[PDB]
Design a protein around this ligand. Sequence first.
Ligand code: GLU
Length: 254
Amino acid sequence: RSLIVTTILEEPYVLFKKSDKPLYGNDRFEGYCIDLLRELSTILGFTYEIRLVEDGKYGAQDDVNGQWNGMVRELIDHKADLAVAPLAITYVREEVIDFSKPFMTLGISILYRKGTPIDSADDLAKQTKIEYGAVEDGATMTFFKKSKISTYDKMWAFMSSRRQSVLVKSNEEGIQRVLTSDYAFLMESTTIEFVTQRNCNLTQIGGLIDSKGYGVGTPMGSPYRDKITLAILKLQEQGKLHMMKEKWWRGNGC
Ligand SMILES: N[C@@H](CCC(=O)O)C(=O)O
């Protein structure tokens, strides 16, 4: 019962602790997902070693060879026993990996600047002066890539024509793109809440375009999946997931 847990750096889910003296092993990290992993470990009774996903991606399937990358691929390859991260539960992913029930719910929305006349995805879709995109090889990118809704297909045609420019490596790169250029970022609503509380000139535009949840990923057939679902439901009912979110979102900014 010693497990390897894969994750990815993403504020406020997983971040390096700030320390004068270097820290080692799991002690290096903090954040909402680290707190969740600690609780799961206590409830389920396993120890673990946190590994950061080597390719730095959440996970998407290659058009050409059907192969996955990112944390999803780490689970398929058995490089990790669990992925404890803001990993979106999606039908395409469910075909190759298992997820616990969700520990947080959210949807794709738009991060942009306040006071503009952009009010929705439809407003972005119909123009080209304001660029827009998403994190490369993550769920939001895959949503647009596969959607048959005209508005979202129109946005994918745009994003996919300027991929090198608008599809970014991380939420951090997308936030900087928003701050340094005329760009709207398609990102998950939980993360937008965090970002806008720290940059008062930024805001969510429109509502949630879809609805999904984050769950702990496991290789298909893992005995840990059902046990982790049970632990999450218990944490949820006890109010612990709500406290954890307040602790890291610090709804104090702005
Ligand atoms: N949480 C997303 C990554 C960020 C995004 O796609 O907006 C994922 O699981 O793929």
